[PDB]
Amino acid sequence: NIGTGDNVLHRAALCGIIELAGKRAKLETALPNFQNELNSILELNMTAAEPTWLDQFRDKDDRSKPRDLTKQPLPKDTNWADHWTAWAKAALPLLNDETHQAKLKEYKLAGLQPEKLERARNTIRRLTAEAVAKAQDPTVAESTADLTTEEDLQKQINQAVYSKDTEPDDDFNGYTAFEGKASTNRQTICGSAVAGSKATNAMDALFCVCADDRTNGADAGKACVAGTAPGTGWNPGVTATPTGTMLQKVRKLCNTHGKTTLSAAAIEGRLTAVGNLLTRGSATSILGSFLATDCSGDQGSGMCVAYTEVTDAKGTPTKDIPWMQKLDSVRIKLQKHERAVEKLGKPQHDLKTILTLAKDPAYLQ
Amino acid sequence: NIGTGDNVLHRAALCGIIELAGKRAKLETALPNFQNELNSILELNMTAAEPTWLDQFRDKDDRSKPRDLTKQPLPKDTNWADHWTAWAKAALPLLNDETHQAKLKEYKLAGLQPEKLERARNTIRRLTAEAVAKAQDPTVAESTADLTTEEDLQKQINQAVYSKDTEPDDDFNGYTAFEGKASTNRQTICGSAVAGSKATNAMDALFCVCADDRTNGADAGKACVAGTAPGTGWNPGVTATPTGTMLQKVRKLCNTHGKTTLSAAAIEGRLTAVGNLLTRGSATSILGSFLATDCSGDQGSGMCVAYTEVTDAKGTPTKDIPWMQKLDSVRIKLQKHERAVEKLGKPQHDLKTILTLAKDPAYLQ
Amino acid sequence: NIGTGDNVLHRAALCGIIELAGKRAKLETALPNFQNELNSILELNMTAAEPTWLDQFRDKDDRSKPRDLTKQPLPKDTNWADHWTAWAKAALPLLNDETHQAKLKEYKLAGLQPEKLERARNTIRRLTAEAVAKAQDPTVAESTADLTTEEDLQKQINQAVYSKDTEPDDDFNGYTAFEGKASTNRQTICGSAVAGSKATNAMDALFCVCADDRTNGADAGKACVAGTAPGTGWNPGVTATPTGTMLQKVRKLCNTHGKTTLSAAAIEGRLTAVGNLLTRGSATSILGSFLATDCSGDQGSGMCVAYTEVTDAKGTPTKDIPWMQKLDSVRIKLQKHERAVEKLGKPQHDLKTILTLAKDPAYLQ
Ligand SMILES: *[C@@H]1O[C@H](CO)[C@@H](O[C@@H]2O[C@H](CO)[C@@H](O[C@@H]3O[C@H](CO[C@H]4O[C@H](CO)[C@@H](O)[C@H](O)[C@@H]4O)[C@@H](O)[C@H](O[C@H]4O[C@H](CO)[C@@H](O)[C@H](O)[C@@H]4O[C@H]4O[C@H](CO)[C@@H](O)[C@H](O)[C@@H]4O)[C@@H]3O)[C@H](O)[C@H]2NC(C)=O)[C@H](O)[C@H]1NC(C)=O
Ligand SMILES: *[C@@H]1O[C@H](CO)[C@@H](O[C@@H]2O[C@H](CO)[C@@H](O[C@@H]3O[C@H](CO[C@H]4O[C@H](CO)[C@@H](O)[C@H](O)[C@@H]4O)[C@@H](O)[C@H](O[C@H]4O[C@H](CO)[C@@H](O)[C@H](O)[C@@H]4O[C@H]4O[C@H](CO)[C@@H](O)[C@H](O)[C@@H]4O)[C@@H]3O)[C@H](O)[C@H]2NC(C)=O)[C@H](O)[C@H]1NC(C)=O
Ligand SMILES: *[C@@H]1O[C@H](CO)[C@@H](O[C@@H]2O[C@H](CO)[C@@H](O[C@@H]3O[C@H](CO[C@H]4O[C@H](CO)[C@@H](O)[C@H](O)[C@@H]4O)[C@@H](O)[C@H](O[C@H]4O[C@H](CO)[C@@H](O)[C@H](O)[C@@H]4O[C@H]4O[C@H](CO)[C@@H](O)[C@H](O)[C@@H]4O)[C@@H]3O)[C@H](O)[C@H]2NC(C)=O)[C@H](O)[C@H]1NC(C)=O
Ligand SMILES: *[C@H]1O[C@H](CO)[C@@H](O)[C@H](O)[C@H]1O
Ligand SMILES: *[C@H]1O[C@H](CO)[C@@H](O)[C@H](O)[C@H]1O
Ligand SMILES: *[C@H]1O[C@H](CO)[C@@H](O)[C@H](O)[C@H]1O
């Protein structure tokens, strides 16, 4: 018969999911950013430019004001419109003569007389073109990795766990278990050898696996605990939908008090643990201790949740069980993010190198 | 006594292995390829070359035909033989004058009068030499990562699971359990506290851990299931070797219906799960529920598989148990592949950058 | 009641920790080193330099002796002091004229007459400056990844497992279980629903979870084994602290005979397994089978270890349980090491590329 601690294995696997929710899942690493370095290289290039080039960025009436492109349209026989935004950003502080001199000193160009500045400028123009070319990576720009944020991943985790973008508070305010579909009795809610559960997310699955009820506190209702049953008072034959107080008595078995570093490997391992614990039968697969007939909570029956999407003839948990597929999608996005972090480190290092060379007076000559 | 669900933990660990077999294990990422970019850079260089250089690639009698190296041997006072294959590949489409002009336009060289083309050619020759140098990585070329394919890894997984290059069909056609060595009774086949099993692969281990037999359908034969026993009808005291129908009734407890993204971390975690479930004793280590004496299938005995290669005094599963060592070898090859993917991303980005610069008329001048 | 094999799950999780100790944990990959290549590039540059530059590195009285900087101080109107150590290292073998000629040949410079050597030298000086700039990565230099060694990580693992820098031998010489704090009886040592254990490390936790004692050899003392109890003879009501012989009878359930490839993912998975097996109650969390009251070793009580740092209202194992936090710190250091390996591969490839170009006579011209 099912008794104290018999579902510790399944509780551990499901709490490995629940612990990821809320705002607890955190990315190891942000995508490398090198815009600062690119902007500095472009500004250094503008600082080294001939005065007549910087003058193109000035208003014709006030040399300290940036050129207005309605007042002074860009010539259509050039490609200047293709580059103006970046050039104007580099030029803006330099329109002030004192700031231009301060930038000359910052970039180690202030010691150069005209012919030596021309020599340096030739190298700088080459280095700057190389920086712009290297800072392009069409395989990352606008990709999944670039468009996906940590907040986006957290919301998707909360969708898998709670069917909501945010984790319910300790009273489960705003949340209705089983999507409002609970009815009849525990085995109707949690499933059986022939029918699936009404649980669409991980938290309601955990509730089916671990909640005590009015009739099993002496035995099966201790399946997920050490000694004291959770004490939900759930009475699904009378009131099918558990209250928020009941849900929280089960959620507090899980680690909701810290953070988790999001990695694809960490999600993969958690999904593999849950997925392979599913016991495949002819019409359903069962998560949790099961001895006979259904997941009714009786010590001779089961403390479990059942799925019809996966059986001994069909189905893959991470594709066919919606909440698991949602988390697998997070895994895939993390794989893309991790590859983008590796790839973007290259232009980051390249641009730091170029800035070093561009500030090296001997190299420039 | 051993009863329903008592081996769910061990079944889950072993099905985590079986699910990798067939063609289900898939690489996250192919090795970055940059041959397209290198070939384009070499072709651009040939397009920019002086006409007398391209003429070296022509037959002396028909200028549209590539030079034949028996008819017109390469001069031995040059290094041309060291480079001819790549040069001739770049030159081949360009031998047609109209195609040469089309390539000049494709590569943004068609606007250049002779002196400006010479200036551009100087930069292109430098960029092309840099591309060739960067496209070399002797630490990846001909390495394990380069020589190992996804098909190779799948075959090695199937060797660990089935001792075959391909996964047996649903009737286990062509397969003989226990390498034909099963005899006597279940405990002889599956092992004991004093002797090892006849199972050399993971599928036959799973069979020992999870198969019901004629005498345990009411009890221990339900160790891996929820309710209904698998129904093999195995009768090893009369006919020791199980049939393909019997094997499939156990294999269908595992997820053979989807795919798995092969990563070193995913294999490591699966091997660590199995390896640490091995219960080390004085003469054997046991995988599966075990109460007394041997893995006979009796509810008072064990539903398990035993190994003599690992004990409480010696042995490491991933080195000393052949099927686990075969999968650990896959893990090692995946680590090398993953490092090669990271390393090859560098020349890939470098060559894309060079192509950008080589097609930039302002940079070339 | 707790009996044979009931703690196999918890033993497996804890042995996944113990197996990392000793010197068994090994890094997949050393940080890429490119000092050899940088040194070669600097030496090639010095080999190509004009004789009057190499002469700056000679003693004024013996041209085969390196310049002494007290005898011949460096001019303060130069930056030579900022570069002297690297230059002098490059110059040292070259002070011998025959060795200088041998290096000219090694670096493919010996075919160059003066004007062609000057042309090559211009390119070499540029390539060498680029190599120096690329070989800088301030995000790795003196970072956690750079300062952390494999020995350092092994010692930290042994601190988590044993509270010592090195793993105790097979007699546990030099080791005292429970930090010398064991007293009274098993439940005082191992904890309960109301009090924490005296175990501060993973090995003593494993002892609480898996040791038999004088009164449970027929039942609960078999929780971690297959058949034969460990046979410690522990009698904590009389002599609380177990002996080294007793500790070794439990440690030998774990894989202490092989090696483990240290990765952040491998540690993360092991910590997640242990952490989520902790059964959270009102005043303590319990690792191990637990039926009633305390971890006394009685078959009706528990074979377990308790922690007050984590409960159903507070605490995260990898932050608040010291031994788990120590191992989580290893995970974090491994993440930094793994990122440094990826990042340092870039300058490694860059410097190999530069060496190739610098030894290419056609490129240099
Ligand atoms: C780092 O800092 C440097 C400055 O030190 C900065 O350099 C500037 O780069 C830009 C972009 O490469 C250069 O832009 C070119 O400008 C010329 C000159 O335009 C003026 O003078 C002409 C001639 O008198 C006038 O007609 C014109 O109205 C302007 O007054 C333009 O001629 C260039 O445009 C042609 O070439 C481009 C390709 O390079 C084409 O994309 C473009 O469509 C134009 O082609 C057309 O005209 C061609 C005539 O030769 C013809 O051949 C084509 O068929 C077609 O009809 C171009 O816009 C600018 O001169 C540089 N400034 C200086 C002072 O040198 C770098 O940009 C900066 N680096 C970075 C990365 O920001
Ligand atoms: C991008 O596109 C460019 C073209 O724009 C292309 O350039 C070609 O590169 C190759 C390889 O670097 C150059 O090959 C050289 O060719 C010369 C000339 O050979 C002809 O003329 C000589 C003299 O009249 C004849 O003797 C000969 O029979 C040919 O008719 C060769 O002299 C070169 O070989 C020597 O130098 C090499 C090192 O660079 C040695 O490896 C080789 O063994 C040779 O050395 C021998 O002779 C030397 C004489 O100087 C002597 O010093 C040595 O001791 C030894 O005895 C070399 O083969 C070719 O000229 C380029 N073409 C043009 C038009 O410039 C790039 O290859 C392409 N980029 C890529 C990456 O594909
Ligand atoms: C690869 O191999 C090459 C050799 O082929 C090697 O090149 C050497 O590089 C170093 C470092 O860049 C060069 O060092 C410079 O040396 C000059 C010359 O000093 C002598 O001659 C002067 C003039 O007669 C004397 O005054 C002096 O006492 C020496 O006899 C120095 O003038 C340079 O120092 C000034 O410029 C530096 C910036 O580049 C400043 O950091 C430094 O503070 C100095 O500035 C001061 O003086 C300036 C005068 O112009 C003035 O403008 C400033 O305001 C300030 O007052 C510098 O030390 C050396 O010449 C190169 N050797 C050759 C033969 O070319 C590469 O180093 C090597 N590559 C690598 C990476 O190792
Ligand atoms: C589950 O199975 C038990 C044992 O047969 C039965 O008593 C319950 O009614 C059922 O839900
Ligand atoms: C396994 O152990 C049981 C219990 O003692 C015994 O009945 C079987 O014969 C043996 O194989
Ligand atoms: C643990 O619980 C059992 C069962 O009530 C009791 O007999 C022991 O004394 C206690 O330590």
Tell me the two tokens of residue A363.
């190299």
Tokens of C336: 């930094």
Interstrand relation of A285-290 and A302-307 (parallel, antiparallel or unpaired): antiparallel
Beta partners for residue B261, in sequence order: B26
Contact (CB<8Å) C357/B289 = no
- Where b means 16+ CB within 10 Å and e means fewer, C5-35 reads bbbbbbbbbbbbbbbbbbebbebbeebbebe
How many CA atoms, within 13 angstroms, populate the side-chain half-sphere of residue B355? Answer: 19
Q: Which two tokens stand for residue A180?
A: 């409002």
Euclidean distance between CA atoms B318 and B123, whole angstroms: 54
C-alpha distances in angstroms, B149 versus B7, B323, B334, B337? 35, 20, 10, 9
Contact assessment for residue B311 and residue B321, using Cβ atoms and an 8 Å cutoff: no
Alpha-carbon distance A213 to A227, whole Å? 15
> Measuring from atom 10 of ligand 5, which residue has the nearest CA?
B301
Sheet holding C302-307, edge to edge: C279-280, C285-290, C302-307
Distance from CA of C137 to the nearest CA of B (A): 16
* C-alpha pair distances (Å), A286 with each of A206, B96, C316, C320: 12, 69, 29, 34
The answer to whether the CB of B38 falls within 8 A of the CB of B132 is yes
The ligand whose atoms approach the alpha carbon of C291 most closely is: 6
Contact between C10 and C277 (Cβ < 8 Å):
yes
Contact C24, C259 (CB under 8 A): yes
Q: Which of B16, B29, B357 sits opposite A276 (nearest CB)?
A: B16
DSSP line for A183-220: -SSHHHHH-BSSS--S--SHHHHHHHHH--BTT-TTTG
Q: Write phi, then psi, for B154 (nearest 5 degrees).
A: -60, -45
Distance, in Å, from the CA atom of A237 to the CA atom of A239, rounded to the nearest integer, reads: 6
Q: Do B226 and A137 touch (CB under 8 A)?
A: no
- Count of Cβ atoms closer than 10 Å to residue C170 Cβ: 12
Partner C, chain B 298-317, Cβ-Cβ below 8 Å: 302, 304, 310, 312-317
Q: How many CA atoms lie within 13 A of A346 on its CB side?
A: 27
Chain C residues close to A16, C-beta within 8 Å: 272, 276
* Distance from the A64 Cα atom to the nearest Cα atom in chain C, whole angstroms: 36
Hey, are the CB atoms on C292 and A227 less than 8 Å from each other?
Answer: yes
Closest CB to C8 among B273, B279, B346: B279
In the block, tokens 């970055």 appear at B32
Cβ neighbours, 10 Å, residue C151: 10
The label of the residue with tokens 């009369």 reads B238
Experimental technique of record: X-ray
Residues present in chain B in total: 365
Q: Cβ(B75) to ligand 1 under 6 A? A: no
Q: And the tokens for B90?
A: 């770049």
Q: Which amino acid is at B337?
A: H
The answer to whether the beta carbons of residues C193 and A226 sit under 8 Å apart is yes
CA max distance for chain B: 94
CA pair distance C53, C61, nearest whole angstrom: 17
Q: Which of residues 171-200 of A touch B (CB under 8 A)?
A: 193
Residue C245: name the closest of C152, C169, C331, C354 by CA: C169
Q: Long-range contact list for C156-159, CB < 8 A, 24+ apart?
A: C156/C326, C156/C327, C156/C329, C156/C330, C157/C20, C157/C21, C157/C25, C157/C327, C157/C330, C158/C21, C158/C22, C159/C201, C159/C326
Q: How far apart are CA A15 and CA C277, in angstroms?
A: 9
Beta bridge partners of B307: B285
Domain segments of chain C: what residues?
Answer: 8-30+160-338, 35-134
- A38 Cβ inside 6 Å of ligand 1: no
User: What is d(CA B204, CA B14) in angstroms, rounded to the nearest whole number?
Assistant: 10
Question: Residue A344: how many CB atoms within 10 A of its CB?
Answer: 21
Instruction: List beta partners, residue C307.
Output: C285
Strands A285-290 and A279-280: antiparallel
CB A106 within 8 A of CB A99: no
Q: Which tokens in the block code for residue C144?
A: 């956690």
Contact (CB<8Å) A317/B12:
no
Spacing of C-alpha B63 from chain mean position = 47
Does residue A298's CB lie within 6 angstroms of at least one atom of ligand 4? yes
Cβ contact C8–B291 (<8 Å): no
Look-up: residue for tokens 């001779």? A300
Question: Which residue is listed with tokens 């430098």?
Answer: B126
Residue type at C132? V
Confirm if A305 and A205 have CB atoms less than 8 A apart: yes
Q: For A313-316, which contacts have Cβ atoms below 8 Å and span 24 or more sequence positions?
A: A313/A282, A313/B252, A314/B257, A315/A285, A315/B257, A315/B258, A316/A275, A316/B255, A316/B257, A316/B258, A316/B259
Tokens 């005292």, located at residue: C176
**For ligand 2, atom 19: residue with the closest CA:** B78
Please tell me the distance from the alpha carbon of residue B176 to that of residue B162, in angstroms, as a whole number: 9
**Nearest chain A CA: its distance from B53 CA (Å):** 28
CA nearest to A259, candidates A4, A7, A21: A21
* Nearest by Cα to B337 from B246, B248, B265, B243: B265
Cα(A178)–Cα(A194) distance, rounded to whole angstroms? 19
Tokens of A238: 């009378």
Q: How far is A338 from chain B (nearest CA, A)?
A: 11
How far are the Cα atoms of A49, A54, A88, B289, C121 from residue A96, in angstroms, in the given order? 15, 11, 13, 81, 41
Distance, in Å, from the CA atom of C33 to the CA atom of C352, rounded to the nearest integer, reads: 11
Instruction: Determine how β-strand C260-262 pairs with β-strand C25-27.
Output: parallel
d(CA C290, CA A5): 7
Pairing of strands C260-262, A25-27: unpaired
| Dihedral sign for Cα atoms in the order C291, C292, C293, C297 | negative
Q: What would the two tokens of residue B299 be?
A: 């509810």
Task: For residue A7, give the 3-state DSSP assignment.
Answer: coil
- Residue among A226, A252, A362 minimizing CB distance to C286: A226
- CA neighbor of B200 nearest in space, from B225, B173, B179, B170: B179
CB A257 within 8 A of CB A249: no
> Of C129, C314, C339, which has the smallest distance from its Cβ to A29's Cβ?
C339
Contact status, residue A306 vs residue C307, Cβ threshold 8 Å: no
Cα A77 to ligand 1 centre (Å): 9
Dihedrals φ, ψ of A289, to 5°? -60, 135
Interatomic CA distance for residues A252 and C313, integer angstroms: 7
Identify the DSSP state of C66: B
SS3 C25: strand
Which among A213, A290, A293, A295 is the best mutation to test ligand 4's pocket, defined by most ligand atoms within 8 Å of the CB? Answer: A293
Q: Show Cβ contacts of residue B326 under 8 Å, excluding neighbours closer than 6 positions.
A: B156, B159, B160
Q: How far is CA B21 from CA A278, A321, A362, C99, in A?
A: 19, 22, 60, 59
Instruction: Please tell me the distance from the alpha carbon of residue A271 to that of residue A266, in angstroms, as a whole number.
Output: 9
Q: Do the Cβ atoms of A66 and A55 come closer than 8 Å? A: no
Q: Decide if A345 and C346 are in contact by the 8 Å CB cutoff.
A: yes
Taking CA–CA distances from C136, the nearest residue in chain A reads: A353
- Closest residue by CA, ligand 4 atom 7: A300
Query: Is the CB of residue B330 less than 8 Å from the CB of residue B304?
Result: no
CB C293 within 8 A of CB C192: yes
CA C333 → CA B269, C19, C150, C202, C267, distances in Å?
A: 20, 19, 11, 20, 11
3-state secondary structure (DSSP) of residue A38:
helix
What is the maximum alpha-carbon separation in chain A?
94
Task: Give the residue, by CA position, lying nearest to ligand 1 atom 61.
Answer: A53
Reported resolution in A? 1.2
Judged by CB atoms closer than 8 Å, whether chains meet at A291 and B4 is answered as: yes
CB-defined site of ligand 2, < 6 Å: B 42, 45, 49-50, 53, 75, 77-80, 87, 121, 125, 128-129, 132; C 111, 361-362
Q: Tell me the C-alpha distance between B78 and C364, whole Å.
A: 17
Chains near B (3 or more Cβ pairs under 8 Å):
A, C
Instruction: Give the CA dihedral A75, A35, A142, A145, nearest 10 degrees.
Output: 180
Residue C167: alpha-carbon gap to chain centroid: 16
C124 close to C305: Cβ distance less than 8 angstroms = no
What is the per-residue DSSP string for A263-318?
Answer: -HHHHHHHHHHHHHHSEE-SS-EEEEEE-SSB-SS-TTTEEEEEESS--SSS--HH
Q: What is the amino acid identity at position C245?
A: T
Instruction: Report the C-alpha gap between A250 and A204 in whole angstroms.
Output: 10
**Cα-to-centroid distance, A242 and ligand 4 (Å):** 22
H or E segment at A155?
helix A150-162
Which parts of chain C are beta strand (E)? 25-27, 260-262, 279-280, 285-290, 302-307
Percentage helix, strand, coil, to 5, in chain A?
A: 50, 5, 45
Cα dihedral C257/C258/C263/C267 (nearest 10): -20
Q: Which of B9, B265, B290 sits opposite C226 (nearest CB)?
A: B290
3-state secondary structure of C260: strand
SS (H, E, C) chain B: CCCCCCCHHHHHHHHHHHCCCCCCEEECCCCCCCHHHHHHHHHHHHHHCCHHHHHHHECCCCCCCECCCCCCCCCCCCCHHHCHHHHHHHHHHHHCHHHHHHHHHHCCCCCCCHHHHHHHHHHHHHHHHHHHHHCCCCCCCCCHHHHCCHHHHHHHHHHHHHCCCCCCCCCCCCCCHHHHCCCCCHHHHHCECCCCCCCCCHHHHHHHHHCCECCCCCCHHHCCCCCCCCCCCECCCCCCCCCHHHHHHHHCCCCCCCCEEECHHHHHHHHHHHHHHCEECCCCEEEEEECCCECCCCCCCEEEEEECCCCCCCCCHHHHCHHHHHHHHHHHHHHHHHHHHHHHHHHHHHHHHHHHHHCCHHHHC
> CA B211, CA B215: separation in Å to the nearest integer?
11
The single residue listed with the structure tokens 């319910």 is: A168
DSSP label at residue C220: G
Backbone angles phi and psi of C294, in degrees to 5 = -160, 175
CA of B77 to the centre of ligand 2 (A): 9
b/e sequence C275-302, b meaning 16+ C-beta within 10 Å? bbbbbbbeebbbbbbbbebbbbbbbebb
- Given the structure tokens 């050399």, which residue do they identify? B200
DSSP annotation of C280? E
Residue nearest to atom 32 of ligand 3 (CA): C78
Measured between alpha carbons, how far is B318 from A57 in angstroms, rounded to an integer?
68
What letter would DSSP give residue A259?
-
Backbone angles phi, psi at C25, to 5 degrees: -80, 120
Rounded to the nearest angstrom, the distance between the alpha carbon of A302 and the centre of ligand 4 is 8
Q: Where are the beta strands (DSSP E) in chain A?
A: 25-27, 260-262, 279-280, 285-290, 302-307
**Which amino acid does the sequence have at B51?**
P
Residue C145: in which H helix or E strand, if any? helix C144-147
Encode burial over A265-292: b for 16+ CB neighbours within 10 A, e otherwise: bbbbbbbbbbbbbbbbbeebbbbbbbbe
Reading the block at residue C1, the tokens are 């009641």
Residue C290, SS3 per DSSP: strand
What tokens does B186 get? 């279940």
CB contact under 8 A, C8 and B277: yes
Tell me the shortest Cα–Cα distance from B181 to chain C, in angstroms: 25
CA distance B86 to chain A (A): 26
Helix (H, G, I), strand (E, B) or coil at C286: strand
Integer Cα distance of A24 and A338 in angstroms:
19
- Distance from C-alpha of A167 to C-alpha of B185, rounded to nearest angstrom: 55
Mutate to test the interface with A, among C87, C132, C276 (most CBs of A within 10 A): C276
* Closest among A279, A294, A321 to B253, alpha carbons compared: A279
**C326 half-sphere exposure, CB direction, 13 A CA radius:** 21
Other C-beta atoms lying within 10 Å of the C-beta of residue C174: 11
